[PDB]
């Protein structure tokens, strides 16, 4: 039953859903990071003792400690329900993603960015959206307190815990170090993910060149070959020509972490990962929330046995990024100003 799996539909719908979830979670993290925007129950000096109890005992649900919490139970359920059920929607999203990724494994899917562009891109987007969403969640320090308070207020109102709490409390704990959990979770996904990412070698490297190489190719010049001005600008990989370099870089960096096994076995995959590691010092999780690549990658790899060769790669790539990436990007911007100016002007004429 492979033609009734509805991959195109499921990938489209889940990718859109995840962006929405990232947006909601982003706003929880910002509000909870700001003491003037935080929910009052986390600031209040009186309730801090009741909060400390819940956090320490999380996820186990169960007194003089919940004395202040007792009278404010209805207001806690009222004001924390928005945040709580956002966390619930993050979990349900995760369950849907995991199911789709398992289905794809079973279907043994051929992935090539230069061939099935939409299938490959969606597959990679979803994995990265999933990954960045779990990392973002891990940065919401007050998430246990929030989920706990809502549930503890729920059990002293309706008798028992919330329907989703047991499974939600588990996800929070299981993904507390999100990339470590995800690296082991993606072992069975590793074959198809590495296939899709390796296909990126036909695009990313040639899209990641220097200003000097852009001048040699006279990139974006309409007038370098005057007799071709009528001829259509085309290639056999059209959507690949303008696909964001920023998006690809995240695919490569996180993706190869998730199928780390291939970094020891495949030089093509290793060299691709390193090219990406040499190009930035941080990535965008979502908007202005950034992920510092080399520190986080080292932390993960120092705690695994068979990858104590990879620490050298990370650090060598880190120095190259700090030393050369800035200037390489600076030269690109100089080139692009000239190229876009000339392009705009010819097109207006």
């Amino acid at each position: 039953q492979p033609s009734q799996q509805k991959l195109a539909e499921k990938l489209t719908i889940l990718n859109d859903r995840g962006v929405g979830m990232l947006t909601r979670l982003y706003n929880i993290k910002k509000a909870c990071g700001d003491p003037k925007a935080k929910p009052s129950y986390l600031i209040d000096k009186n309730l801090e003792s009741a909060v400390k109890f819940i956090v320490r005992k999380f996820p186990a649900v169960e007194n003089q400690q919940l004395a202040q919490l007792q009278k404010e139970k209805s207001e806690i359920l009222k004001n924390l329900a928005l945040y709580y059920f956002t966390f619930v929607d993050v979990m349900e999203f995760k369950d849907h993603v995991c199911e789709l990724l398992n289905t794809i494994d079973v279907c043994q899917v051929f992935f090539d960015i230069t061939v099935n562009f939409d299938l490959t891109k969606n597959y990679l987007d979803l994995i990265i959206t999933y990954t960045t969403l779990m990392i973002l969640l891990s940065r919401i320090e007050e998430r246990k307190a929030i989920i706990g308070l809502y549930n503890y207020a729920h059990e002293m109102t309706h008798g028992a815990s919330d329907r989703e709490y047991p499974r939600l409390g588990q996800m929070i704990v299981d993904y507390e170090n999100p990339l470590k959990k995800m690296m082991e979770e993606f072992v069975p996904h590793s074959k198809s993910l590495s296939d899709a990412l390796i296909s990126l070698q036909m695009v990313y490297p040639r899209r990641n060149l220097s200003a000097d190489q852009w001048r040699n190719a006279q990139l974006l010049s309409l007038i370098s070959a005057p007799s071709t001005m009528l001829n259509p600008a085309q290639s056999d990989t059209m959507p690949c020509e303008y696909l964001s370099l920023d998006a690809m870089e995240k695919w490569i960096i996180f993706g190869f972490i998730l199928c780390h096994g291939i970094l020891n076995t495949d030089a093509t995959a290793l060299n691709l990962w390193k090219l990406a590691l040499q190009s930035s010092s941080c990535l965008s999780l979502f908007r202005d929330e950034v992920f510092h690549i080399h520190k986080a990658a080292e932390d993960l790899f120092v705690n695994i046995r068979g990858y104590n060769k990879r620490i050298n790669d990370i650090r060598e790539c880190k120095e190259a990024a700090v030393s050369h990436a800035g200037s390489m990007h600076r030269e690109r911007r100089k080139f692009l100003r000239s190229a876009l100016k000339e392009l705009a002007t010819v097109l207006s004429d």
Binding site: P226, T228, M229, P232, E342, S348, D349
Partner: protein
Amino acid sequence: LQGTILQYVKTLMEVMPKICRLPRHEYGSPGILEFFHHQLKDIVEYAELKTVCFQNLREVGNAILFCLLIEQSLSLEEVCDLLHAAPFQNILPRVHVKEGERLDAKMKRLESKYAPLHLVPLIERLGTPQQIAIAREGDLLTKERLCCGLSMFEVILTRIRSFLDDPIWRGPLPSNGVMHVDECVEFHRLWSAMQFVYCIPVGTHEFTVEQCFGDGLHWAGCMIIVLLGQQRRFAVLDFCYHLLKVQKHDGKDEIIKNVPLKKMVERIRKFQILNDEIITILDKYLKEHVRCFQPPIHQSL
């Protein structure tokens, strides 16, 4: 334009190099400077370029400047006339409204105050049919000025464009069906050669082009380009602008054929600024379907 300038444009377009490509960045700014020197040698050495060609252009520029500036003076003269006409023509400025008052309430009340000054109504009340008719005609002449809704500079420019009907301003149809690039068959390209000449630094005790001709020279040269619709192609294809672009990138400084490159590109920037101001002004005052192209077609149909 149709006489001596046309004559020298036709002459210099032939002396001009048939084809002139903008050399790639990699050659370096010094080499690009050397390239332009050689390629444009005959424009550089043309004995009457300043005495005749720049001179006649400066005169065109000064003429077009006179029109712009005289229109502006006229506008200043008219606006002052109208301000003094205002009290006899019922025209009142906006008045300050304190709380508890209306804008319409006081403006009507102030109109009452200055009603004895309203000229035409007063004569219509107390004057003879001859007096009334003269005042009515006088009032129409006083209120209806050019500054009210009319301008002239656009008409001046539109009419100068029709003086450029000779085929050597625009040249032959482009080989590629789009635009000329390497070919030097359009006026803007000759202007680029002329710009090369006037950007060359001279001795510390020699007079410069700006000392000799002032801005009028550039107003004329830029006016021709704009009216021919050549300003975008000039911006892209200009020799000096290209040299400046490459020098900015590589930051090299050599004395090529007695032209110190740094000094040369500094001057180019100054004229680039001036040209852009002039072109922008001309375009502003000179306030549809485009040429479309065919996608590839299969032998099938």
